[PDB]
RNA sequence: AGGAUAGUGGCCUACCAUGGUUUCAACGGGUAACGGGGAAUAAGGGUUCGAUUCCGGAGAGGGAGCCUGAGAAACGGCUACCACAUCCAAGGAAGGCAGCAGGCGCGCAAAUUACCCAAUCCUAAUUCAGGGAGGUAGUGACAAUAAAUAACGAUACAGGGCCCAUUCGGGUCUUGUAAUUGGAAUGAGUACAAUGUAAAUACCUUAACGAGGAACAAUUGGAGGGCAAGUCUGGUGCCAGCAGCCGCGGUAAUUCCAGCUCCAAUAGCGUAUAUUAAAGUUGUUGCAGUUAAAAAGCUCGUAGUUGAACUUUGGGCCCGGUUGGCC
């Protein structure tokens, strides 16, 4: 008889069953328990400013071979240290150390992207200006 | 995960490109006119072998 | 909280004043008076919005501060004076006596009447009590106390008031075969000759009503108001007579009525 | 001014304000579009006020032009106008003078200063140390 | 107090073909205009779907269906031969675009192209009745067809030749007996 | 039973009794929780959101207490303590923007120390005063609506429909290409004016000036598949870099850096996060459970869920409603 109760007065069993079984999809468990606000260096935010501690060359995952030119970044609102990827050939030269950058997610909603291991974020802005603008020479970085 | 990677090689190809400059060309229309242009270029001119057409065919 | 509200916003004001809502701001709050906040019509609304004699509140005030307009034989220079059902408004300009009545859609119909009909008004007795020194009194829907009436005036009857002397000329009982003007409810503005009554002790007495088109319906006795016998009202009724021609009949009219 | 052609729609008499209130409709082809004062003159010429018991306002032009519509009043006396009509319209028509008063926040500052009650004598001499 | 929406699959070449054909036939600058007509048509269709689910000789059906039909007839989308609340579902974007003014200008003559018609409309020429109009998306109500004409202003219908002729008259005709 | 209260009442206590709630989820914890009207997205069912422009609850740095009064446990009102903090001729005094505008911090993340009571309405002994409530403008690509960036000819090339249906006669014409060229239409922008407005700025009107490109110049993303659009050129050579996924790149790269061309949406287009559909991948509608995840070791058993058939059927006679269909 399909397992579930079909009876006209079984709505309690049905809804308590749902309540207990919704804790098997990742999205529901995330929403309810709260993992953005506890874990997740961006506390449920889309972006986050951080101070560049270091530049890094991450060797890609197999079967590819390359060095991906990321940065170690300390966040301002948490103090969490975070690796973040600098796209768009060059732009590791346009960043420098102790620069203020703005980080965004690297696209895949938590989990990492492509051949870059451990990295979950990308750099969007440096010292108030966009890396895209600097790369296309629409603007120039403020030094002073 | 990894410290070692010689960051000097950054910007290599974009620095090494044989910079070509953009050719100044006539102005393309914008909007209603462009749609007129495309309607012509689609339903007037081109087709290909026995059933087909291509919109950016390379020279052969 | 902390005392009573003095303001009233556009969107909170009863729908039968017809002004505008979204951050259109404020509406005229009826002052305390004989009638309730929602079942009333202030003079600012009666004059600026319906008759179009004025365009602004300062114009309405300029009118009211000249003893031109009087409600029930009394001037009422207050801007937000709550005028209500079966209230007589008298302007010596054009000698227009306005009765406030209801159209069938529930708005306040602007009925024009004769001076002889403006001489009086009607009142539904809400309670009948003894006052101090054994003096019986009746209270109407317009907060009018009347001492020493006929002892047959029981509750929910209606009364004819002479409006200059607050005295009773004649009363009409609540019984079957009596006309009714519904005040309040979905069926507001309908006129339908009581069929019968349903008691329900402790439970909101109901009344079954029958329009001239034999369109029976049901209302609450607090919302019922008698006005006369079968086919002999005591007031000039408005254009419509409380029938509620359905939307279909209405479009049939305003398409076949007139090509204008 | 070729066939200016003023018309008056929706005429209401208002004895309790002593006015006739109506809608002005100007059909004004191929000219400089309205001239409110030309309307005042052309309208007093037919409502018998000579200029000044007439007030008129609002006057939007149809898209495309050649026509404008506004609201109009004509009173039974210039006195009735000068008491009923508002002072900004009287100033527009030159039948009054807009008072030269101070700015709003200046008036308010003055009120807040005058909320503090004093003037008697040589204690006048040490107001350099009020707020500093 | 606001409204509009757009399609589902951003590609699908058959749609692109159809949309661009309509755009070229009717003189349009965007796919947003086709999307707009499809949106209107969807509202109409789902309304009529609900009414058809209702009972026949049902008051809401009669009222709202006759109203919808009357509106579409007086616009001229729904022909007066088919007035039964099923061709309302059978309608199409071509049937609306044919009643657009730009199209009506061209089909009534007077412009020798839909693009010229659009230009004339937006250049403070064509008027409807006597009101000048500058919107191609106007939906003539089947009676102003015999009132679409050049304006009392607007050369090709009236007064001063404007700018280019006015200036060339001085560049040329005044420059005769220098 | 009394006291207190505006009044009911363990509200408060005296005496007395020992009850009251709970697997139909009590009590406790959490809430990145004010509640609703409502919003977003959905074939239908639904999931998520709801600090807000209505409604009512609260609160005025935290707590507590109270005067006045019809109404306050009031904070643009007092009293105290705590915490922050201002003036000082150091004795004392005065504070509370989660009202308005500022823009110190916080940060991914949000405007002018502007004009006015002319409208909406409110208060006042009041038609006259006041009102940062409110309206007006400024900043404003939050979102939405409409909608320019060009149209039509003539000559040189590749075609022809129809008028007079009197032979290749004139053509009101037609589909694209030009180091071919013409006169026409304007508006964006300036701006006399009036209009608009409390007064202005804009809108709608409108004299005059305001297109021919080198000019009044539309971007944003992409061109391996998914997924519309390169069997082009140059460079680099598992490097640089692209890539949501699958995958490109190791000396002939349809994926990188550029040029050309082409595509999609277009004054809007991308990216990040969240959420909805897709997702019958939460499954009441509507999943699955031999072997892909999952039948409990087996039986008993309470709550819960679910529970065999049977009791006035059938036949007539009238009344008057809605639809047809002669005419």
From Swiss-Prot, chain A:
The modification 3,4-dihydroxyproline is found at residue 63. Hydroxylation at Pro-63 affects translation termination efficiency. The stereochemistry of the 3,4-dihydroxyproline has not yet been determined. One of its GO terms (biological process) is maturation of SSU-rRNA from tricistronic rRNA transcript (SSU-rRNA, 5.8S rRNA, LSU-rRNA). It is found in: Cytoplasm. Keywords: Cytoplasm, Hydroxylation, Isopeptide bond, Ribonucleoprotein, Ribosomal protein, Ubl conjugation. CDD domains: Ribosomal_S23 (cd03367). Changing residue 63 to A: Lethal mutation. One of its GO terms (cellular component) is ribosome. Its main location: cytoplasm. Component of the small ribosomal subunit (SSU). Mature yeast ribosomes consist of a small (40S) and a large (60S) subunit. The 40S small subunit contains 1 molecule of ribosomal RNA (18S rRNA) and 33 different proteins (encoded by 57 genes). The large 60S subunit contains 3 rRNA molecules (25S, 5.8S and 5S rRNA) and 46 different proteins (encoded by 81 genes). Belongs to the universal ribosomal protein uS12 family. This is Small ribosomal subunit protein uS12A. It comes from Saccharomyces cerevisiae (strain ATCC 204508 / S288c). The lineage of its organism: Eukaryota, Fungi, Dikarya, Ascomycota, Saccharomycotina.
UniProtKB/Swiss-Prot annotation, chain C:
The lineage of its organism: Eukaryota, Fungi, Dikarya, Ascomycota, Saccharomycotina. Residues 41-104 form the S4 RNA-binding domain. Belongs to the eukaryotic ribosomal protein eS4 family. Present with 573 molecules/cell in log phase SD medium. There are 2 genes for eS4 in yeast. The modification Phosphoserine is found at residues 31, 246. It comes from Saccharomyces cerevisiae (strain ATCC 204508 / S288c). GO terms for molecular function: RNA binding; rRNA binding; structural constituent of ribosome. There is a cross-link at residues 61, 133, 160, 167, 173, 178, 210, 232 (Glycyl lysine isopeptide (Lys-Gly) (interchain with G-Cter in ubiquitin)). Pfam families: 40S_S4_C (PF16121), KOW (PF00467), Ribosomal_S4e (PF00900), RS4NT (PF08071), S4 (PF01479). Gene3D superfamilies: 2.30.30.30, 2.40.50.740, RNA-binding S4 domain (3.10.290.10). The gene is RPS4A. This is Small ribosomal subunit protein eS4A. The modification Phosphothreonine is found at residue 114. InterPro entries: KOW (IPR005824), Rib_uL2_dom2 (IPR014722), Ribosomal_eS4 (IPR000876), Ribosomal_eS4_C (IPR032277), Ribosomal_eS4_central_region (IPR013845), Ribosomal_eS4_central_sf (IPR038237), Ribosomal_eS4_KOW (IPR041982), Ribosomal_eS4_N (IPR013843).
UniProtKB/Swiss-Prot annotation, chain D:
InterPro entries: eRP_eS24_sf (IPR053709), Ribosomal_eS24 (IPR001976), Ribosomal_eS24_CS (IPR018098), Ribosomal_uL23/eL15/eS24_sf (IPR012678). Residues 101-132 are annotated as: Disordered. One of its GO terms (cellular component) is mitochondrion. GO terms for biological process: cytoplasmic translation; maturation of SSU-rRNA from tricistronic rRNA transcript (SSU-rRNA, 5.8S rRNA, LSU-rRNA). GO terms for molecular function: structural constituent of ribosome. There is a cross-link at residue 20 (Glycyl lysine isopeptide (Lys-Gly) (interchain with G-Cter in ubiquitin)). N-terminally acetylated by acetyltransferase NatA. Also partially acetylated by NatC. The modification N-acetylserine is found at residue 1. Keywords: Acetylation, Cytoplasm, Isopeptide bond, Phosphoprotein, Ribonucleoprotein, Ribosomal protein, Ubl conjugation. It comes from the Eukaryota. Component of the small ribosomal subunit (SSU). Mature yeast ribosomes consist of a small (40S) and a large (60S) subunit. The 40S small subunit contains 1 molecule of ribosomal RNA (18S rRNA) and 33 different proteins (encoded by 57 genes). The large 60S subunit contains 3 rRNA molecules (25S, 5.8S and 5S rRNA) and 46 different proteins (encoded by 81 genes). HAMAP family: Ribosomal_eS24. There are 2 genes for eS24 in yeast. Belongs to the eukaryotic ribosomal protein eS24 family. This is Small ribosomal subunit protein eS24A. It comes from Saccharomyces cerevisiae (strain ATCC 204508 / S288c) (Baker's yeast). The lineage of its organism: Eukaryota, Fungi, Dikarya, Ascomycota, Saccharomycotina. The gene is RPS24A.
Swiss-Prot record, chain E:
Belongs to the universal ribosomal protein uS4 family. One of its GO terms (biological process) is ribosomal small subunit biogenesis. GO terms for cellular component: 90S preribosome; cytoplasm; cytosol; cytosolic small ribosomal subunit; nucleolus; nucleoplasm; small-subunit processome. One of its GO terms (molecular function) is rRNA binding. Component of the small ribosomal subunit (SSU). Mature yeast ribosomes consist of a small (40S) and a large (60S) subunit. The 40S small subunit contains 1 molecule of ribosomal RNA (18S rRNA) and 33 different proteins (encoded by 57 genes). The large 60S subunit contains 3 rRNA molecules (25S, 5.8S and 5S rRNA) and 46 different proteins (encoded by 81 genes). Interacts with snoRNA U3. uS11 interacts with MPP10. Component of the ribosomal small subunit (SSU) processome composed of at least 40 protein subunits and snoRNA U3. The keyword rRNA processing applies. The gene is RPS9A. Pfam families: Ribosomal_S4, S4. This is Small ribosomal subunit protein uS4A.
């Amino acid at each position: 008889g399909k397992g579930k109760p079909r009876g006209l007065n079984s709505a309690r069993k049905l809804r308590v069953h749902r309540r207990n079984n919704r804790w098997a999809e990742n999205n529901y468990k995330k929403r309810l328990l709260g993992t953005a606000f506890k874990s997740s260096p961006f506390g449920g935010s889309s972006h986050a400013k951080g101070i560049v501690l270091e530049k890094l060359g991450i060797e890609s995952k197999q079967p590819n071979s390359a060095i991906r030119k990321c940065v170690r970044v300390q966040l301002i609102k948490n103090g969490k240290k975070v690796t973040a990827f600098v796209p768009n050939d060059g732009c590791l030269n346009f960043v420098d150390e102790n620069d203020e950058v703005l980080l965004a997610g690297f696209g895949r909603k938590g989990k990492a992207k492509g051949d870059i291991p451990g990295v979950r974020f990308k750099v969007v802005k440096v010292s108030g200006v966009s890396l895209l603008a600097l790369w296309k020479e629409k603007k120039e970085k403020p030094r002073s | 995960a990894k410290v070692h990677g010689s960051l000097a090689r950054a910007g290599k190809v974009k620095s090494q490109t044989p910079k070509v400059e953009k050719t100044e060309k006539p102005k393309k229309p914008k909007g209603r006119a462009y749609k007129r242009l495309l309607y012509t270029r689609r339903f007037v001119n081109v087709t290909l072998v026995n059933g087909k057409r291509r919109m950016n065919p390379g020279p052969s | 909280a902390r005392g009573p509200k003095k303001h009233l916003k556009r969107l909170a004001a009863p729908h039968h004043w017809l002004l505008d809502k979204l951050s259109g701001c404020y509406a005229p709050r009826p002052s305390a008076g004989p009638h309730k906040l929602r079942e009333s019509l202030p003079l600012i609304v009666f004059l600026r919005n319906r008759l179009k004699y004025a365009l602004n509140g300062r114009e309405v005030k300029a009118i009211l501060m000249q003893r031109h307009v009087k409600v029930d034989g009394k001037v009422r220079t207050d801007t937000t004076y709550p005028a209500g059902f079966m209230d007589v408004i008298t302007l010596d300009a054009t000698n227009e006596n306005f009765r406030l009545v209801y159209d069938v859609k529930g708005r306040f119909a602007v009925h024009r009447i004769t001076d002889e009909e403006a001489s009086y008004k009607l009142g539904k007795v809400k309670k009948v009590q003894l006052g101090k020194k054994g003096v019986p009194y009746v209270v109407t829907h317009d907060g009018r106390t009347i001492r020493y009436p006929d002892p047959n005036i029981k509750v929910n009857d209606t009364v004819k008031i002479d409006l200059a002397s607050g005295k009773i000329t004649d009363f009409i009982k609540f019984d079957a075969g009596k006309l009714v003007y519904v005040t309040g409810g979905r069926n507001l503005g309908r006129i339908g000759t009581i069929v019968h009554k349903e008691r329900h002790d402790g439970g909101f007495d109901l009344v079954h009503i029958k329009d001239s088109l034999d369109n029976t319906f049901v209302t609450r006795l607090n919302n019922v108001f008698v006005i006369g016998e079968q086919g002999k009202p005591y007031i000039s009724l408005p254009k419509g007579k409380g029938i509620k021609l359905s939307i279909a009949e209405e479009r049939d009219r305003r398409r076949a009525q007139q090509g204008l | 001014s070729d066939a200016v052609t003023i018309r008056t729609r929706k005429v209401i008499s208002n004895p309790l304000l002593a006015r006739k209130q109506f809608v002005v409709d100007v059909l004004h082809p191929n000219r400089a579009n309205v001239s409110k004062d030309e309307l005042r003159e052309k309208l007093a010429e037919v409502y018998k006020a000579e200029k000044d018991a007439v007030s008129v306002f609002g006057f939007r032009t149809q898209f495309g032009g050649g026509k404008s519509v506004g609201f109009g009043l004509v009173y039974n006396s210039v006195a009735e106008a000068k008491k009923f009509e508002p002072t900004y319209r009287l100033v527009r028509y030159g039948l009054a003078e807009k008072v030269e008063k101070a700015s709003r926040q200046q008036r308010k500052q003055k009120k807040n200063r005058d909320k503090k009650i004093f003037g008697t004598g040589k204690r006048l001499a040490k107001k350099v140390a009020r707020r500093n | 107090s606001k409204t509009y929406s757009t399609p589902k699959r951003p590609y699908e070449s058959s749609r692109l073909d159809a949309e661009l054909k309509l755009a070229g036939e009717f003189g349009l600058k965007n796919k947003k205009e086709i999307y707009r007509i499809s949106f209107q048509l969807s509202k109409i269709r789902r309304a009529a779907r609900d009414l058809l689910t209702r009972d026949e000789k049902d008051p809401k059906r009669l009222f709202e269906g006759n109203a919808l039909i009357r509106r579409l007839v007086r616009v001229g989308v729904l022909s007066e031969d088919k007035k039964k609340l099923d061709y309302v579902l059978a309608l199409k974007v071509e049937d609306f675009l044919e009643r657009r003014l730009q199209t009506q200008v061209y089909k009534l003559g007077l412009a020798k192209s839909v693009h010229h018609a659009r230009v004339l409309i937006t250049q403070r020429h064509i008027a409807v009745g006597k009101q000048i109009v500058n919107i191609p998306s106007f939906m003539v109500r089947l009676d102003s067809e015999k009132h679409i004409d050049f304006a009392p202003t607007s050369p090709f219908g009236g007064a001063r030749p404007g700018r280019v002729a006015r200036r060339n008259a001085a560049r040329k005709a005044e420059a005769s007996g220098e």
